[PDB]
Design a protein around this ligand. Structure first.
Ligand SMILES: [Mg+2]
Ligand SMILES: [Mg+2]
Ligand SMILES: [Mg+2]
Ligand SMILES: [Mg+2]
Ligand SMILES: [Mg+2]
Ligand SMILES: [Mg+2]
Ligand SMILES: [Mg+2]
Ligand SMILES: [Mg+2]
Ligand SMILES: [Mg+2]
Ligand SMILES: [Mg+2]
Ligand SMILES: [Mg+2]
Ligand SMILES: [Mg+2]
Lengths: 129, 51, 100, 55, 88, 218
RNA sequence: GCUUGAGUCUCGUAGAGGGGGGUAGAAUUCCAGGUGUAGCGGUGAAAUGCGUAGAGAUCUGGAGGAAUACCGGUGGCGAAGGCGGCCCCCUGGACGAAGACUGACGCUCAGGUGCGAAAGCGUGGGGAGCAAACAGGAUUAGAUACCCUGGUAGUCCACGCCGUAAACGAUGUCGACUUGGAGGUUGUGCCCUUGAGGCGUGGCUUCCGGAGCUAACGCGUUAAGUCGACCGCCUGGGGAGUA
């Protein structure tokens, strides 16, 4: 059931991508957005778009560089069944540094490079590379 | 079933019986009950009758 | 209130108790504020196979709108009455006229 | 089909013997083949049609 | 499964108006209606196991709905079960 | 823009999902390809095609079917171009090194047709050795001499030529090919939409390819 | 608070979905009688068995139980078990088309409760055919079998037990996402209905097949692919599903 949307996002992406699908949409939310943000701002998607009002609709434009998709792997990490939280010193780094980890902090949803520089930590929503 | 054959001829002309009864429902009802096993039978009668 | 087809068939040797019957069954349904959408005294008809010994028997068609109650006691009256050698009250879905 | 009383339209969906003719032969549609058989079974009961050709 | 006349009657006896059809109270009551009706169907028969399944489904549905109301508006809850006559 | 009078599209169901981007069809149980997206594929098509033909064109007009074999042993055959118009003896690229002597037997025989031994031995051996040569001729004509190693490859019917194309993909050979709606692209580097087994789209583009190798740098 | 998740409401549609009662023809066995006369029955071959008290064969009338040919179909319904003549009554679920109402009321679920083929048990019925047991006849080296002649429980009904099956898709439930192709079945919108149709749009179903997955076989939008929620369960064979 709907129960975990954020994985559903991570997934609708993962999938469409593997389906060399141009765009991809889904029910939106404060949260979906903030991540679609980091995802664009870190250059894993072209650009997002939320087209509705009562029943908002996040829409992401996918990217493809060579022939490949740009997003080579996108996984949940925290989840309803099992929440993950890391302190600053204990934040994770994906692919040695390449690619990134989305972490939500008391100062908003930012990357790991980010939250690290911000000197704090929070819930590690997902990994991406 | 019935042939009320008329005038000029002597041959049986009853190819009718190879269109229904006889070995039809007769070789059928003759023996082992069956029960759930005709299912397994007729399940091959379509696997076949697909092509 | 529902409808039904209904089509009892009667023994020849009771042929002219058919007017009395139809009279009666209709008096019975009308009585309970039910209509009667078709009626057809098909009379003596030949049988597709002999039933009960004897061939040919008198048919009667009907088409009623009546409550599950009079339609009940009809089916019985049909048993009680060993002059009706068959009967069959049927479907419904809205009245019907003409056919046959 | 639409009706069991239709012995005229009905008598061309059965063999000499009186056996219901399979849809495959008549090429009828599904939904209706049932409607058909029902209407036939009805007629057989009301002696409007032979179960058998044994008469 | 209950009449249009009957079901109507009760919407009109429990909601704001005919149309306020999905009002908690209403659902409960037209459920409660069918359950009770049924008690006699299963009085005779009793071996109608299959149909019985549907009836329980009615009870547990109603049960969850009753549970909802109570949490929401307790005031409305109590009135209901009184007026519907259950929860001994 | 268009030039293909009547090659429009072709091929009914049997369509390959991956061939959607070049389809605008839907005429009476059959796709018309996207005419207006094929021609931008003569651009690039005959371009890198020629861009190498002046760097020196070694080709292989590979295309078979007793229904366009001869129409390939044509000006397709004639120019800076080799060809195959019969059963693609599988491994003829990937095993050229074995096949290279299936050549030696062709020559060392016809070179000896009106020469060497010939009208001699027996008049059994005769046409009973020209059957050796006849056989060889088709499927191993166009090969004859391969002077400059097979360099690009131009194929009529992508998939019907499973093997040919495959070998190329394996040996790093450009493969230019036209692909009907039904066929699988991506085996083909330079892809050309539109019909691939009708007497026109052949000759047309086929003949038109002969026209760009046969002239690049005088 | 919100309306898309989930319900409620309206009119319809298909269905061997369940429960109860009624009823029909075909056959078998039996009883009675006509005609008729020496065999019938059975097997690989036999014999046991049946027939001169007249069998089998045929015809007519009658009794009774059990199951419903044809339709019939990788057809349909149900949670699973499983559900096929016809009719009425009672009743569960599913689906579709419009909009209207509720407003997260949801998913899952150890414990618990219910249901749950066949066989089997308890009291009473009921008993045509079938048939463990048992008897006879054969086969065989042996034959506690396979085959034959018989035939008891049982197989049927009511009431109540039992709670198991390769109870299997050997695939837990719910949700979202991801190329295609040919069928079957069932709703519904539009099109000179002017074709027995034309183009869409749901529910369910069979076959084939792409990525992907897999030890492989295979699965593949009805996943065994890609993800998440909760539950069940596995940790070498035998011992043992035993003590
Ligand atoms: Mg009898
Ligand atoms: Mg008799
Ligand atoms: Mg219903
Ligand atoms: Mg139980
Ligand atoms: Mg039992
Ligand atoms: Mg018993
Ligand atoms: Mg025995
Ligand atoms: Mg078990
Ligand atoms: Mg498959
Ligand atoms: Mg499909
Ligand atoms: Mg899954
Ligand atoms: Mg034990």
């Amino acid at each position: 059931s709907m129960q975990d949307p954020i994985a559903d996002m991570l997934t609708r992406i993962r999938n469409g991508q593997a389906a060399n699908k141009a765009a991809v949409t889904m029910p939106s939310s404060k949260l979906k957005v903030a991540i679609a943000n980091v995802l664009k701002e870190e250059g894993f998607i072209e650009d997002f778009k939320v087209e509705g009002d009562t029943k908002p609709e996040l829409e992401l434009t996918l990217k493809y560089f060579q022939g490949k998709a740009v997003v080579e792997s996108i996984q949940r990490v925290s989840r309803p069944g099992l929440r993950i939280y890391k302190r600053k010193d204990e934040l994770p780094k994906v692919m040695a540094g390449l690619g990134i980890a989305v972490v939500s902090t008391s100062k908003g949803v930012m990357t790991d490079r980010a939250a690290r520089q911000a000197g704090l930590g929070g819930e590690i929503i997902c990994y991406v590379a | 079933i019935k042939v009320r054959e008329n005038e000029p001829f002597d041959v049986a002309l009853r190819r009718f019986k190879r269109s229904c009864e006889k070995a039809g429902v007769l070789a059928e009802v003759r023996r082992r009950e069956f029960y759930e096993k005709p299912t397994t039978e007729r399940k091959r009668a379509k696997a076949s009758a697909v092509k | 209130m529902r409808h039904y087809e209904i089509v009892f068939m009667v023994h020849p040797d009771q042929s002219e108790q058919v007017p009395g019957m139809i009279e009666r069954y209709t008096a019975a349904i009308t009585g309970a504020e039910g209509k009667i959408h078709r009626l057809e005294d098909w009379g003596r008809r030949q049988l597709a196979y002999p039933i009960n010994k004897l061939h040919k028997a008198h048919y009667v068609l009907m088409n009623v709108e009546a409550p599950q109650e009079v339609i009940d006691e009809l089916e019985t009256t049909f048993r009680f009455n060993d002059a009706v050698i068959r009967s069959m009250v049927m479907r419904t879905k809205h009245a019907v006229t003409e056919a046959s | 089909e639409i009706d069991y009383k239709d012995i005229a339209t009905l008598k061309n969906y059965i063999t000499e013997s009186g056996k219901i003719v399979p849809s495959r032969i008549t090429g009828t549609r599904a939904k209706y083949q049932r409607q058909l058989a029902r209407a036939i079974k009805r007629a057989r009961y009301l002696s409007l049609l032979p179960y058998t050709d044994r008469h | 499964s209950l009449s249009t006349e009957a079901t109507a009657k009760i919407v009109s006896e429990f909601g704001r108006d005919a149309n306020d059809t999905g009002s908690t109270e209403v659902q409960v009551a037209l459920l409660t209606a069918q359950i009770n009706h049924l008690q006699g169907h299963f009085a005779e028969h009793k071996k109608d196991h299959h149909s019985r399944r549907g009836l329980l489904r009615m009870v547990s549905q109603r049960r969850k709905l009753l549970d909802y109301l109570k949490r929401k508006d307790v005031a409305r809850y109590t009135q209901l079960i009184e007026r519907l006559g259950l929860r001994r | 823009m268009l030039k293909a009078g009547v090659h429009f599209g072709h091929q009914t169901r049997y369509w390959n999902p991956k061939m959607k981007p070049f389809i605008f069809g839907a005429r009476n149980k059959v796709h018309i390809i996207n005419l207006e997206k094929t021609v931008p594929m003569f651009n690039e098509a005959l371009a890198e095609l020629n861009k190498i033909a002046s760097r020196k064109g070694k080709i292989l007009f590979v295309g078979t079917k007793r229904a366009a074999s001869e129409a390939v042993k044509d000006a397709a055959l004639s120019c800076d171009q080799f060809f195959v118009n019969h059963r693609w003896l599988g491994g003829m690229l990937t095993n050229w090194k074995t096949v290279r002597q299936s050549i030696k037997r062709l020559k060392d025989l016809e070179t000896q047709s009106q020469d060497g031994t010939f009208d001699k031995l027996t008049k059994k051996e005769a046409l009973m050795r020209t059957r050796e040569l006849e056989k060889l001729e088709n499927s191993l004509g166009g090969i004859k001499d391969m002077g400059g190693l097979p360099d690009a490859l131009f194929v009529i019917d992508a998939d019907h030529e499973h093997i040919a194309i495959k070998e190329a993909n394996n040996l790093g050979i450009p493969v230019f090919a036209i692909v009907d709606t039904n066929s699988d692209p991506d085996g083909v580097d330079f892809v050309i939409p539109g019909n691939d087994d009708a007497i026109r789209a052949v000759t047309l583009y086929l003949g038109a390819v002969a026209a760009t190798v046969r002239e690049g740098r005088s």
